[PDB]
Write a protein that binds this DNA or RNA. Structure first.
Ligand SMILES: [Mg+2]
Ligand SMILES: [Mg+2]
Ligand SMILES: [Mg+2]
Ligand SMILES: [Mg+2]
Ligand SMILES: [Mg+2]
Ligand SMILES: [Mg+2]
Ligand SMILES: [Mg+2]
Ligand SMILES: [Mg+2]
Length: 1306
RNA sequence: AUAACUCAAUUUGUAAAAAAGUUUUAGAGCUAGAAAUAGCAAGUUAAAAUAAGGCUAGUCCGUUAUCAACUUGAAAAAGUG
DNA sequence: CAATACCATTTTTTACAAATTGAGTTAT
DNA sequence: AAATGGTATTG
């Protein structure tokens, strides 16, 4: 009887029900409630609308940040508990004053000066120590006994802001010997190159290298002090290495292979090992010198002070910042006095200007302040202040955005210094030095997670003992090993074939043997003599493995031929059938280990298999080297200490697909052979793992054969689309219920298809490329949003097809070409797009860029690939012409993929639907598919609309969502009716190329009468009518023109953050929300703008006047998210606390956002809040006006446009009727009318597009601004909810077919 | 359509960390002059909170998912035209 | 009252697993 | 990254 059409989107699910003749039924539905209507007729077409589903990301960030805050607090508490007793003797209430420092004097228990308790001592303190860093340095360097409170302040300041943990081990600053070290590097280099020596030259290496410029700049200056020495040269590269940069050494050493070294990267020792093996170890001392120079210079950006003077170079550098700020401030003030005293007031007094006053007291940033005074500085006569400005070193504060560079090791250094200094005077500091250091030091390992005790959904850590966990007892109380193990294993896949078995490490030796053999097994070969291509035998395979795979990292086909087939079988020439260029599989771990253990015979020994598998397992499972070592301790007797040291560092990540038991555990009953045995040797049939697993003769297969919401949430994809999936399932259920619990014949489903990342991509790709184009043409992140500019930079300001430069001022003349033409592949991304001055230079139009273009441009594309400026996909598409380009079969494939859905998520949807609809099995125990789920791509219905002029304009209303579903149902049912053999492609469940091409390219022709075709379209085998050109189109037009369509906005309780996060200053307003229980916002300030979880109808009585008369009230109260739980626990008490009395509890109506209300003339409003409403109506514009608008915005149709210009006036008339009846924004409507009146002279096209603009005035939901032409219309908002309180509440089903209407008269 | 491998791009989810920002308080402003109001002097730092808070009391948890109305359920969801 | 203009926490690092897309080899 | 509901201020 009926089929269902569905359109699944991120914010919408369109739905429709059709009959055998493509009609949508109209049914009478019962209306519940206290209203007049007992029923309403509804057409069975509509669309569900809903706010986007959100990722769990923001929540994760908030949660983790929370944990950070509490843990920092705990650090401070530990510190205070250590200091407690000895502080009690010095100061009774010090810590108390510290914790109540936020309180106003009126609220304080103790006196207002935190540190010392009186004015004189406090002022004295601040006079002696203007910044905390002054106190830090003094406490580090001095020898005098210090006040315990000052000591605490220093220690606490270092602990509260400890710095990062990105560098392992410890640092011990030594800026002292940079000159001697640089001279030493130059020395050893000159030794190694006796022929040509570099002159030390009195080059102030210290100044240039520790200067506050970027690494690269300092390099340039350094080699600028060097004659005949280029930055790309050997020594230049070495200097770059010492600077913490990543240089490449291959061009210096004639190496074909890349040799890039970065001292910070953990692979440095090994990369350098390989380089030295390639070039000779007489170059080792050179790199040693580079490293030695690197250590003394490592933290030059941070320290800025000679390490001789102090043991606190950081705090000293901060003190420097302070002093320079001071001096330059005195100077600047003096200057402005002398030369521009008129602007002095704006600079040093006005907080709102971005001056120095706005800088210090206002919310102006260092950048904004700098930008403010740049012109002031340069216009005056000041020359050095600009230098400081360009250095970003003008008037610096100590607490800045760029202090994230600071590693915890330096704060640790100062901490330890202070501790050593004052432990001489305070014994408890001596006894507790290690604890305190460990407070700053300790960090919960990421592989351990939250230190929970059975109440954290997120935690996995296991306890070695039942103590409360502290930083000092962590190793003893927490089972770190089992915790890391859990960290990885709670996420890792189990073998699907053997669900109880863990998957092997990807770099497992066994797994790679399995992969290499699984690949080798299907390799065939032919020679001149033999009569057919032959498999490799067991013997031959072991030969190839032992000789090639166990000697060469990768094994090429050429190596197979020459090194095996030629050398061992005396074949001068041979053909290979199973492998391409080189074997994909490789025994990489075998060679890694071989480099480490140095004992091939140990590896080849079968008895060491378990041990090796355990070692690789340990290497994969853990990455904490300290634990890896402990894991390997058993095998310490097997190899030397150096070998163990090397084995620690070898680390693997990733897990395979299969288990050890599958590969080498299960044995075939008849054979007694494992899978791997069959891969090694299977005689005549060289059977695959796939074959092995499905072979009825073998016993492997049989040995193996041993909630909707959860299911949807478990799928892979955006949560936004998952929301749509759940919604569409529920819609289907309700539709089936509507149709008397009869299942549909068919269900047709369709599914819908920055700047910082771009700037990063370009910066890296260019730096790697070595291009100056960023320096020549500076960009900003928001400029790259332009496609042509982004491309331009991705191609290094070059033509992609022609090997010539492009112009940044001529992009409008240039073309964006699709690499594989749009007709075949609907790809709009950068992976398929290219900037060239003209697309003709691509070559042919019907294909991949031509062979000439490939030949001429290939290497450039290689460079772009290596700089990551183009991906591999893009490259391989660019270069396809040297593989014959696009084959006709590929063309056909692209065409059928244009209309046949391959997306996995949609297949999941189709499967969910199919499994819900078909639940019965026949007498043969096979599924009875009563309902056919059909999946269509958007192109079918889009093309159908264009061809037969069923035009779509999204902005008019939300009806198009439903219309698309209707057309989906129609077109789908028609398609399967006409071509039942196509069931395999479009329906869920279980020469020629040109033919396929034409076929799929012309599949939708049966709808047309002339392209000639009969008026009636029927299916040959059954003769059943599929289409009737004489009436079915008319029916479609009737359906699309149907005025009433069930568009339902999903009512939703608002969730998430309580309010805006901003912490506002104190203000006299009841809107201000306390940040803490005792913190009155009139005194302390706080939060603002809370989010309404849901409104609530209250009818009750409230006091009025001094005498507290009981007046009667009916009103909407917004229950905020923060208030929610309290309101649910006991609503009566909550409402009574709000000031309501005699609350009629039974009349309480929960009103979530988007609640629907009908009023006077069909006029509707949706609940936006407790104090604002949204538009609740859909403007049903006649199809003539929609089609006319489509044609006018974008020859017979042109003359149709010119013939029907009166349609504009009729459309605006429609809009006006609508607005006056429903929108009620007279002023805005008058501005619309006026604006249209002024622009009647303008071209019809423009006027039409701008008429399209006019519809947001009439659109459903939140009011929004729009421009008619140059006239901007501000939104008319609905700032009151009074009328709704006497309106009619409409409770809607998911389809909106069932309604309960409540006349809110009470 | 499925399975393993290779190369790459992407998406989702989790953990451990860092630097700012903000808000109050503390950094005795000063001479004049009744008084606003002038003139100058100043400014870089710190403490504390950073979802209100919760019981399960852990160096744990608090912003995702899910939600018509009536009847039933704890809850999912069911039962109703 | 309701017309109106302004506002909205930001940024960084490390470690990890799973899908999926889509170009290839081999198979059910 | 909008955009759209809160807020103070004005009209
Ligand atoms: Mg659609
Ligand atoms: Mg807290
Ligand atoms: Mg600050
Ligand atoms: Mg290959
Ligand atoms: Mg590992
Ligand atoms: Mg939610
Ligand atoms: Mg701060
Ligand atoms: Mg509803």
């Amino acid at each position: 009887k009926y089929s269902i059409g569905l359109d699944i989107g991120t914010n919408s699910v369109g739905w429709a029900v059709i009959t055998d003749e493509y009609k949508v039924p109209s049914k009478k539905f019962k209306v519940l409630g206290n209203t007049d209507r007992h029923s309403i007729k509804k057409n069975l077409i509509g669309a569900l609308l809903f706010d986007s589903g959100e990722t769990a990301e923001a929540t994760r960030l908030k949660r983790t940040a929370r944990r950070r805050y509490t843990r920092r607090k705990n650090r401070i508490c530990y510190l205070q508990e250590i200091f407690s007793n000895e502080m009690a003797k010095v100061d009774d209430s010090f810590f108390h004053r510290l914790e109540e420092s936020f309180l106003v004097e009126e609220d304080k228990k103790h006196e207002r000066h935190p540190i010392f308790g009186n004015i004189v001592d406090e002022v004295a303190y601040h006079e002696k120590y203007p910044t905390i860093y002054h106190l830090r340095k003094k406490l580090v360097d001095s020898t005098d006994k210090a006040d315990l409170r000052l000591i605490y302040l220093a220690l606490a300041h270092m602990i509260k802001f400890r710095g990062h943990f990105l560098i392992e081990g410890d640092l011990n600053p030594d800026n002292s010997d940079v000159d001697k070290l640089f001279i030493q590097l130059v020395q050893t280099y000159n030794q190694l190159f006796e022929e040509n020596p570099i002159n030390a030259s009195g080059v102030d290496a210290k100044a240039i290298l520790s200067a506050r410029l970027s690494k690269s700049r300092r390099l340039e200056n350094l080699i600028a002090q060097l004659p005949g020495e280029k930055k790309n040269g050997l020594f230049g590269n070495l200097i770059a290495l010492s600077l913490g940069l990543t240089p490449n050494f291959k061009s210096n050493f004639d190496l074909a292979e890349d040799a890039k070294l970065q001292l910070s990267k953990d692979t440095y020792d090994d990369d350098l090992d390989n380089l030295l093996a390639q070039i000779g170890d007489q170059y080792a001392d050179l790199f040693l010198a580079a490293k030695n120079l690197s250590d003394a210079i490592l933290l030059s950006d941070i320290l800025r002070v000679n390490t001789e003077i102090t043991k606190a170079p950081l705090s000293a550098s901060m003190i420097k910042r302070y002093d320079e700020h001071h001096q330059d401030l005195t100077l600047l003030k003096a200057l402005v006095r002398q030369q521009l005293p008129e602007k002095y007031k704006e600079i040093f007094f006005d907080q709102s200007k971005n001056g120095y006053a706005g800088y210090i007291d206002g919310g102006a940033s260092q950048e904004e302040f700098y930008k403010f005074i740049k012109p002031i500085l340069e216009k005056m006569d000041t020359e050095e202040l600009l230098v400081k400005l360009n250095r970003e070193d003008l008037l610096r504060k100590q607490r800045t955005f760029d202090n994230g560079s600071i590693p915890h090791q330096i704060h640790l250094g100062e901490l330890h210094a202070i501790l050593r200094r004052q432990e001489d005077f305070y014994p408890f500091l001596k006894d507790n030095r290690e604890k305190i250091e460990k407070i700053l030091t300790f960090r919960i390992p990421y592989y351990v997670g939250p230190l929970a005790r059975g109440n954290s959904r997120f935690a996995w850590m296991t306890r070695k003992s039942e103590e409360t966990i502290t930083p000092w007892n962590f190793e003893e109380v927490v089972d770190k090993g089992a915790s890391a193990q859990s960290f990885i294993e709670r996420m890792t896949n189990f073998d699907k074939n053997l669900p109880n078995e863990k998957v092997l490490p990807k770099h497992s030796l066994l797994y790679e043997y399995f992969t290499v053999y699984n690949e080798l097994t299907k390799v065939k070969y032919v020679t001149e003599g033999m009569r057919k291509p032959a498999f490799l035998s067991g013997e031959q395979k072991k030969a190839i493995v032992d000789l090639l795979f166990k000697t060469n990292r990768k094994v090429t086909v050429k190596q197979l031929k020459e090194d095996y087939f030629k050398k061992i079988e005396c074949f001068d020439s041979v053909e290979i059938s199973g492998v391409e260029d080189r074997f994909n599989a490789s025994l990489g771990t075998y060679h890694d280990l071989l480099k480490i253990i140095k004992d091939k015979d140990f590896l080849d020994n079968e008895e060491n298999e378990d041990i090796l598998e355990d070692i690789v397992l340990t290497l994969t499972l853990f990455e904490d080297r300290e634990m890896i070592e402990e894991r390997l301790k058993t095998y310490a007797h097997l190899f030397d200490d150096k070998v163990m040291k090397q084995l620690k560092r070898r680390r693997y990540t990733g897990w395979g697909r299969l288990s050890r038991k599958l590969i080498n555990g299960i044995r075939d009953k008849q054979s007694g052979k494992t899978i791997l045995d069959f891969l090694k040797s299977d005689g005549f049939a060289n059977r695959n793992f796939m074959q092995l697993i499905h072979d009825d003769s073998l016993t492997f297969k049989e040995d193996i054969q041993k909630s909707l919401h959860e299911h949807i949430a478990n799928l892979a994809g955006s949560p936004a689309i998952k929301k749509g999936i759940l919604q569409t399932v529920k819609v289907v259920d309700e539709l089936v219920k509507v149709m008397g619990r009869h299942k549909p014949e068919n269900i047709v489903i369709e599914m819908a298809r920055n700047s910082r990342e771009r700037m990063k991509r370009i910066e890296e790709g260019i730096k790697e490329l070595g291009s100056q184009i960023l320096k020549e043409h500076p960009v900003e992140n928001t400029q790259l949003q332009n496609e042509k500019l982004y491309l331009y930079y991705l191609q290094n300001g070059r033509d992609m097809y022609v090997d010539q430069e492009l112009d940044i001022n001529r992009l409008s003349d240039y073309d964006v070409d699709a690499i594989v033409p749009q007709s075949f592949l609907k790809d709009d991304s950068i992976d398929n797009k290219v900037l060239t001055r003209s697309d003709k230079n691509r070559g042919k139009s019907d294909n991949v860029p031509s062979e000439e273009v490939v030949k001429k441009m290939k290497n450039y594309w290689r460079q772009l690939l290596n700089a990551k400026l183009i991906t591999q996909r893009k490259f391989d598409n660019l270069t396809k012409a040297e593989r014959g380009g696009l084959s006709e079969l590929d063309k056909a494939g692209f065409i059928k993929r244009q209309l046949v859905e391959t997306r996995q998520i949609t297949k999941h949807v189709a499967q969910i639907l199919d499994s819900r609809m078909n639940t019965k099995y026949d007498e043969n125990d096979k599924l009875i598919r009563e309902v056919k789920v059909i999946t269509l791509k958007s192109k079918l219905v889009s093309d159908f609309r264009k061809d037969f002029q069923f035009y779509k304009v999204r902005e008019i209303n939300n009806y198009h969502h439903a219309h698309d579903a209707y057309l989906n149902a129609v077109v789908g049912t028609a398609l399967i009716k006409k071509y039942p053999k196509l069931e395999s492609e479009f329906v869920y469940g279980d020469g020629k190329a040109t033919a396929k091409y034409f076929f799929y390219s012309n599949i939708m022709n049966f709808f047309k009468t002339e392209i000639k075709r009969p008026l009636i379209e029927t299916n040959g085998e059954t003769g059943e009518i599929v289409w009737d050109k004489g009436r079915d189109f008319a029916t479609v037009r009737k359906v699309l023109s149907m005025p009433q369509v069930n568009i339902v906005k999903k009512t939703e309780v608002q969730t998430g953050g309580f309010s805006k996060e901003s912490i506002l200053p104190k203000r006299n307003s009841d809107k201000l929300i306390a940040r803490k229980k005792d913190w009155d916002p009139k005194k302390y300030g706080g939060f603002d703008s809370p989010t309404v979880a849901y409104s609530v109808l209250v009818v009750a009585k409230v006091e009025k006047g001094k005498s507290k008369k009981l007046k009667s009230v009916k009103e909407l109260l917004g229950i905020t998210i923060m208030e929610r739980s309290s309101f649910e626990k006991n609503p009566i008490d909550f409402l009574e606390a709000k000031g309501y009395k005699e609350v009629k509890k039974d009349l309480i109506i929960k009103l979530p956002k988007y609640s629907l209300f009908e009023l006077e003339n069909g006029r509707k409003r949706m609940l936006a809040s407790a104090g604002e409403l949204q538009k609740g109506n859909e403007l049903a514009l006649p199809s003539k006006y929609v089609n006319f608008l489509y044609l006018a915005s974008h020859e017979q149709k042109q003359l149709f446009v010119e013939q029907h210009k009166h349609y504009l006036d009729e459309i605006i008339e429609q809009i006006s009727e609508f607005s006056k009846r429903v929108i009620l924004a007279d002023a805005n409507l008058d501005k619309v009318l006026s604006a249209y009146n002024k622009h009647r002279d303008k071209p019809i096209r423009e006027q039409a597009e701008n008429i399209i603009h006019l519809f947001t005035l009439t659109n459903l939901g939140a009011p929004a601004a729009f421009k008619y032409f140059d006239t901007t219309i501000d939104r008319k908002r609905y700032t009151s909810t009074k009328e709704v309180l006497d309106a009619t509440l409409i409770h809607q089903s998911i389809t909106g077919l069932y309604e309960t209407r409540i006349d809110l008269s009470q």
